[PDB]
Amino acid sequence: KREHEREVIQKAIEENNNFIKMAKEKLAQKMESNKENREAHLAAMLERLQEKDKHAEEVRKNKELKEEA
């Protein structure tokens, strides 16, 4: 009976610790995935904007070459 009493309380401890561990790991995973997703979104936005700057240089250069006519 004493052996059983010990097993019940160690079981309670194990389940509580595993709940904490799971919760901690789940939160870390979510926050990392979120961070990565947001950063990728912003990066895509800035990449498109930089293409715009690229195109603008191209336009001014095209005007330059036609004024060399």
């Binding site: 936005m45 336009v59 095209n62 005007k63």
Partner: protein, 426 residues
């Protein structure tokens, strides 16, 4: 605080921009010298959203004034509230844009944009917590349309996590006969669909019609049109400028008003619009939902509302406003999409516009806005199929491919509005 930075570019942009500051300065009790002389603490509680506080208890509009020509801004400086603006915040060139979007966007405008950004940076640096930006401009000219949309793209690059808001004046032959305006408008819309979070469509077509048809003005001046614009801009920014619960900042407004990123073009409205010598909550409400009161030349009963914000101003029964807003939704249920529940939000502000006991301002995200874009598109293609006046733009380095792309994008936007208009819950 949550600061907004205001930018106004080109003639139209600086005109309606100046009127905006005159109108809200009066509302907030700020005189032409930047001193406060109001009679209500409600006036100053959120003053910092739009004004910087300097030495001597002076309030200075967080406003930047841009043009590729000195003209309009010289007269701004000579306006009533001309001395209120920060002199270092005047940025201008000498060339002019000649009603050419390409000069504004790629050439002249690009030569000046960096000096503008220097001022934007200086205003933004001393912000406790910058919300974002609002731009006033026309789409029909060269500077506001071309350099305006260039500024948007450049600002976006440095402030990618801030809200970008525009008051964009759409061109109409009823007001301006400048032939290339549908070119400039279409090229501009092409930028706005990609790079702004929310755009108020101030349609010169609608402004003219209101003045001519309703107000019986045979010959509307820019003065008349701009009263409509300033009344509207005052109304749609009251939730930003005074204490309140609904849409109290730029991002909360966007999150309530924009269900899909590209569909961020709003139909503004105002009440009362009545001729001289010709006002219940029920009557205010019915009027603000009538097509005759819209600042965009679209009939909302030719489409459906995705989202709506209504702002009532003045002393009135909150119970009565709630009942009438419920009533209008009930009687007009067909014109609100069923798959966005509770898509109409209402605010009441105790402080009315100058000279009025009661007023209502309307912000609609309606699929009927496609009528505005179809009108621009019809005028665009009639010129573009003949390749009329293209050398103005290609001579600046552009090619026809960009015109085609801008046209397709705007035509895509129309298709998208029609898609959500046709969508059902089942």
């Amino acid at each position: 605080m949550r600061e907004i930075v205001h930018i106004q570019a080109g003639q139209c942009g600086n005109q309606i921009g100046a009127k905006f500051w005159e109108v809200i300065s009066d509302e907030h009790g700020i005189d032409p010298t930047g001193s406060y002389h109001g009679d209500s603490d409600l006036q100053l509680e959120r003053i910092n959203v739009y004004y910087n506080e300097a030495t001597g208890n002076k309030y200075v509009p967080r406003a930047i004034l841009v043009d590729l020509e000195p003209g309009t801004m010289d007269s701004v400086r000579s306006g009533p509230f001309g001395q209120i603006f920060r002199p270092d915040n005047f940025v201008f060139g000498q060339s002019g844009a000649g009603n050419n979007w390409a000069k504004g966007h790629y050439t002249e405008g690009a030569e000046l944009v960096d000096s503008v950004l220097d001022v934007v940076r200086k205003e933004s640096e001393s912000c406790d917590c910058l919300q974002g930006f609002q731009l006033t401009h026309s789409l029909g000219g060269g500077t506001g349309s071309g350099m305006g949309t260039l500024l948007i793209s450049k600002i976006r690059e440095e402030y990618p996590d801030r809200i970008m808001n525009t008051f964009s004046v759409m061109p109409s032959p009823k007001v301006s006969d400048t032939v290339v305006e549908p070119y400039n408008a279409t090229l501009s819309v092409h930028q706005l669909v990609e790079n702004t979070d929310e755009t108020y469509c101030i349609d010169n077509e609608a402004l003219y019609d209101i003045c001519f048809r309703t107000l019986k003005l045979t010959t509307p001046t820019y003065g008349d049109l701009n009263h409509l614009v300033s009344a509207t801009m005052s109304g749609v920014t009251t939730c930003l400028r005074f204490p309140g619960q609904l849409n109290a900042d730029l991002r909360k407004l966007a999150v309530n008003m924009v269900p899909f990123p590209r569909l961020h073009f709003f139909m503004p409205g105002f009440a009362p619009l009545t001729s001289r010598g010709s006002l219940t909550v029920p009557e205010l409400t019915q009027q603000m939902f009538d097509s005759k009161n819209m600042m965009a030349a679209c009939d909302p009963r030719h489409g459906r509302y995705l989202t709506v914000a209504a702002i009532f101003r003045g002393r009135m029964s909150m119970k009565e406003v709630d009942e009438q807003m419920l009533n209008v939704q009930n009687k007009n249920s067909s014109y609100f999409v069923e798959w966005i529940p509770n898509n109409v939000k209402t605010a009441v502000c105790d402080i009315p516009p100058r000279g009025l006991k009661m007023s209502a301002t309307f912000i609609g995200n309606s699929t009927a806005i496609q009528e505005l874009f179809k009108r621009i598109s019809e005028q665009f293609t009639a010129m573009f199929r003949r390749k009329a006046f293209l050398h103005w733009y290609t001579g600046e380095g552009m090619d026809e491919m960009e015109f085609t792309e801008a046209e397709s994008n705007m035509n895509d936007l129309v298709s998208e509005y029609q898609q959500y208009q046709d969508a059902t819950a089942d």
